[PDB]
Amino acid sequence: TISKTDIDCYLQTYVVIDPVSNGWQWGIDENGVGGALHHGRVEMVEGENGYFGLRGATHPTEKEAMAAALGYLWKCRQDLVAIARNDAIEAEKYRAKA
């Protein structure tokens, strides 16, 4: 009975929302820390013609870039989803305990 937004609570640390001048381009942080400077192994990707940036469309608002990031994570990368699932289950058991 663990809902989807409680899994998104721990899945959102795997995304990174970089600011560009047009808008907000989401990405994927493989180390799960939101693209930190030192502990952050961000996933950079190779595109069509010399594209080395974040996997993610340049969205107008952060609310939609984060939503497209969460939708990509739910569609394709289910190992990070299983990580966030077990995190949400341990959080629910923690609030059942403390």
Binding site: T13, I17, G32, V33, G34, G35, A36, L37, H38, H39, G40, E62, D79, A82, I83, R85, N86, D87
Partner: protein, 306 residues
Amino acid sequence: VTDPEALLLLPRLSIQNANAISSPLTWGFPSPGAFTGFVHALQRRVGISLDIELDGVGIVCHRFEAQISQPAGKRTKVFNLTRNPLNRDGSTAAIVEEGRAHLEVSLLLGVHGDGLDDHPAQEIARQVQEQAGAMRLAGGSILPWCNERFPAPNAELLMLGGSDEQRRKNQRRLTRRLLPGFALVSREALLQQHLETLRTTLPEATTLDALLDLCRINFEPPWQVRDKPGWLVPIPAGYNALSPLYLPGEVRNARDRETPLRFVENLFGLGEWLSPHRVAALSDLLWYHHAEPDKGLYRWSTPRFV
């Protein structure tokens, strides 16, 4: 403590099963107490014959590989273990989890004494390296470099320079030699001033909480992560007393019955992995001991850092 007259460099030593468990709260690179105890064992085993005093170690860590694994569906890591022998009845023993890590460190040893004059520099450098080849550095064997391209030799750099330009020149010559790693220093003034900042934020703060605050990656609302100055690891910076000092032949089951035993407990401080050309003087960044045994507080740090 006292300044090094020379600076000996043990080159890239390969350690195969070093203790990844630094302390009860920290894992990863082994504690600087391991390296300071290794250099005191080097003093105790070869330094009392060359009439020198090997004191102070600078830790560099060119390569690090922990024998860890990330379990499926888990964010954290566990340790890959070894299969111990059985009991006398044939059952599997109870597993005691030890962390093993493959290091490649190079040590800068502070050498001072009258044996610098009596012997050549390459002779005492060769002697401490041939003694270090039979030793172990955090519980792990020092791999002695057979049949690669060339063996990495030593260099005992006399810190006494005839000019400041020549001194900066051979500090650069040594820093280029120990470059692909990251020197490990102690930033406890940064830990205390971060505790002071956290106490102006919220009163009744402990510096365990300030240490944790320097460890985490904090997410901040407008979202952005809070940046950090450097790498800023937690290290065990010594021991603190739990018992009064017991007499040599008084405590039970000690290592030797000629040394006073005292039950101690870790003292977690802050470290900082920085590159060796950010220090601009390699005679700093050397880890010494500080005992003050009447109070407890057996600890190591690198004083004279900043």
